[PDB]
Amino acid sequence: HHHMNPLLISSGEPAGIGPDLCLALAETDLPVVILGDLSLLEARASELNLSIKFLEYSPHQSFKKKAGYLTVWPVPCAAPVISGELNPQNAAYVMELLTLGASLCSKGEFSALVTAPVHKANINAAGITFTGHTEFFADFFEVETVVMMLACSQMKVALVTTHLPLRMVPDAISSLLIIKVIQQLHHSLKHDFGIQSPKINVAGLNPHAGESGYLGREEIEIITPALNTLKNQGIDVLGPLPADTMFITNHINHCDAYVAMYHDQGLPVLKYAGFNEAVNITLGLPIIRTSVDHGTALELAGKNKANPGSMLAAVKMAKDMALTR
Ligand SMILES: NC(=O)c1ccc[n+]([C@@H]2O[C@H](COP(=O)([O-])OP(=O)(O)OC[C@H]3O[C@@H](n4cnc5c(N)ncnc54)[C@H](O)[C@@H]3O)[C@@H](O)[C@H]2O)c1
Ligand SMILES: [Zn+2]
Fold first, then answer.
1. Over the range 253-281, which residues count as b (16 or more CB within 10 Å of their CB) and which as e?
2. Which residues bind Zn(2+) (predicted)?
3. 131, 133, 83, 132: which is closest to 105 by C-alpha?
4. Is 120 helix (H, G, I), strand (E, B) or coil?
5. 135 to 174, 285, 289: CA distances (angstroms)
6. Domains of the chain: which residue ranges?
């Protein structure tokens, strides 16, 4: 073909805003193909009073996207969808979108995967153990270390640990894990974001980075040794820093990415600064995968209230990465 192979969009939890966000792509010229139930997409468009012409995907049709059309790779829900109403019978459908999306991108049929939001509890309620797309894709591709990084114009925040109960965070953090996470972060910033010598600022685990060992020992026993190892590999880390002020910039503390030890240590600030522009990108897979930075927003499904800014940013980032692959 002439144009790039299209981006594949998993439409996510069907009762949530994922379908709505995919329908918002119909008015763009972004080269996207939607994985989802075609009847669902048509019915959601009707509920939203949108006039969209749907095409079924074919590899023998043009990769150039035209406004007003939406190309779909149909995957059938087990049961018809009611907006805002979770149905555990459709959890396997969601997992099929993830599995088919990973597989089709792995084979090069599509140039990148973008994920609309999924409802984790609904998947688990159906009997499918699931902590997030990030771990699902790591397992699918048999990659030991992947990194969740949220990115916006204000900042990039990578996580050492992702979806864990807070009780499990300290035991999950080892020096080796920090090293492997930051090695992947450094590699991606240099090779995929064009940052020649990344500067990475790293939070401590404990308040005030453990208060010189008086408020937890993990900085002394785990984090600082890991950062020393990374420095001696030539990776320009600074830390451990207190998370409550690390995100405040000054004339000298500039960095290319922050590392937070756990989910709620880093994501609240990032989403406060850039919720409607930020992208969740998974580092370390053999495919490009980006994501919205928000959840299913079930109460907004079918209501024309959700902001498509994160989805649009996620598609554009995936496109930019695919063009520079
Ligand atoms: N990438 C993903 O698949 C992903 C990411 C985050 C959360 N989730 C899942 O989503 C479900 C809901 O969790 P939550 O309630 O913590 O997250 P959420 O983002 O669904 O809701 C948080 C708040 O943000 C609002 N919101 C979310 N997206 C919005 C948008 N595009 N425009 C306007 N307002 C928006 C919601 O109305 C709500 O007030 C959970 O199952 C969670 O695991 C999935
Ligand atoms: Zn989360």
1. eebbbbbbbbbebbbebbbeebeebbbbb
2. 163, 263
3. 133
4. helix
5. 18, 11, 12
6. 1-325
For Cα atoms 170, 173, 179, give the angle at the middle one, nearest 5 degrees. Answer: 160
Give the resolution value in Å: 1.4
Task: Tally the C-alpha atoms within 13 A of residue 164's C-alpha that lie toward its C-beta.
Answer: 16
Six-digit token string for 259: 């590392």
Report the structure determination method. X-ray
Name residue, tokens 């309620």: 125
Strands (E) located in the chain:
7-10, 32-36, 53-56, 69-74, 112-115, 147-151, 156-159, 199-203, 236-241, 257-260, 279-283, 289-292
Q: Tell me the three state secondary structure of residue 217.
A: coil
Please tell me if the CB atom of residue 294 comes closer than 6 angstroms to any atom of ligand 1: yes
CB 295 near ligand 1, within 6 Å? yes
Cα-based distances in Å from 210 to 88, 136, 175, 181: 43, 33, 16, 21
Query: 128: which 2 tokens?
Result: 């499918």
Q: Which residue, among 105, 157, 134, 151, has the nearest Cα to 288 in the 3D structure? A: 105
Ligand 1, pocket-test mutation among 296, 299, 300, 304, most atoms within 8 A of CB:
296
